[PDB]
Amino acid sequence: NLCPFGEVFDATRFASVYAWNRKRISNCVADYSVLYNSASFSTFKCYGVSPTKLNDLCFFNVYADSFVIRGDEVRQIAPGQTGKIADYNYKLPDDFTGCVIAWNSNNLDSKVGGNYNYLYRLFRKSNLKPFERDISTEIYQAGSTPCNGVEGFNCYFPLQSYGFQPTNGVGYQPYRVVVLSFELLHAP
Amino acid sequence: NLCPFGEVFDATRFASVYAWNRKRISNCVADYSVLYNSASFSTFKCYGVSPTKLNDLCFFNVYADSFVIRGDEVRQIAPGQTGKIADYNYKLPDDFTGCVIAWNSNNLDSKVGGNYNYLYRLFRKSNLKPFERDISTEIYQAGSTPCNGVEGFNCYFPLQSYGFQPTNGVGYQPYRVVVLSFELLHAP
């Protein structure tokens, strides 16, 4: 039985980058050929492994992390990057063994008047550790006076929305991203 | 004749932060008392000069730089700051002699459905030098292939709009900012 790469790549709805969606793939035959013939991906970049020798090695688990970001910040998905989507939403380790795949989804994620269902974390006290997610919506104390959940002056709500519309530039349109991290440990 | 501080502070429309508006005030009696009684300012911070001894010193020119930013980035208007409004839109020197004044203008700059007339520069090749403005709208080559004004993939339009609406948080609402820099040179 082939590993499911049509329920991760061809799914109906993707998760926001702050609450990204991790799926552990195991106990199957990893048929990555589905990613070699697909001509929609705008980025297929492999770190650690060669992008054609993914079949040769046998791994314990393959974690597919899927989310939706903008076109400007697809480059922030890589080892040793900084930004708003690289230390507050999704952080990759400095020694990463996996592959990042990103393709334009303006025709799925952008509706008339704006699709404000895709949020991203703008404020956070400290940078994320690799492969950590934060789904908290607590008020960010950006000043010097405790907020206690009122969201006023110098107390901002962290989760800012994405203004995706079909008229945006190709660099401001929604890109769907899937990060396949290959995890190998001492086990079958 | 009192120096004009009602055509800078009480003007009808403010300029965007990227194309900020500089007015040189000279040949008048600097009556800063209008700024001591005004109770609307949320920030009145003076660097170099004491905020009450502004009358005692006699300066050659007073440059009032007015613009509109968001509430999150009013703190980026200060000597030795970094961000998107501190090295791409408006940069203050490390040895600054002046005063920054900022007040909330949600009831003037935010209309129903959004006031997208206030732009800010998001992309730039190099950081601004102190007291420099850039009003160019050339396409930003963020990739490795020259754009030549097409605005496609990895070629972004720098000027991004502000989504000001009356429902935003007090930290996401439009703040009007006026920076009075005191310039003294050997002259009357």
């Epitope: 705008s42 297929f44 970049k45 492999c46 480059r75 | 990739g143 490795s144 292939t145 990895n154």
Partner: nanobody, 119 residues
Framework: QLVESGGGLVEAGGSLRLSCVAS????????MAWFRQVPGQEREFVSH????????YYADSVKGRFTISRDNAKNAMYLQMNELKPDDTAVYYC??????????????????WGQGVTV
């Protein structure tokens, strides 16, 4: 960032050796490539070499002629050209990216880029 050397008028049948040194990166985690651009046409792809050096790819017009290689003891890569027909005179760019793409032909898959070589 990416300095490069070599290039110049040849005797149309001899050899040449372009080289590309990196001066701000580890060069042990960076996959390198060589592109070529002629004025009046898009930038072509010359060759590509992943980490270590055992994984090399060449264009379908310079296969067999050019030899790509890399040396980590001085942070350099080399494109040894051996035929130099009168149709490959162009600017030659050196590119380096942290990862190894399946579309190694695409110039958008390389973050850092070097200067240009003589035409």
């Amino acid at each position: 960032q990416l300095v490069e050397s070599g290039g110049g008028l040849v005797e149309a049948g001899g050899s040449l050796r372009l080289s590309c040194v990196a001066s701000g990166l580890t060069f042990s985690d960076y996959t390198m490539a060589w592109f070529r651009q002629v004025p009046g046409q898009e930038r072509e792809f010359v060759s590509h070499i992943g980490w270590g050096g055992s994984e090399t790819y060449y264009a379908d017009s310079v296969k067999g002629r050019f030899t790509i290689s890399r040396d980590n003891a001085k942070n350099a890569m080399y494109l040894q050209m051996n035929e130099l027909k009168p149709d490959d005179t162009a600017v030659y760019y050196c590119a380096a990216d942290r990862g190894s793409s399946f579309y190694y032909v695409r110039e958008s898959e390389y973050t850092f880029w070097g200067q240009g070589v003589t035409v």
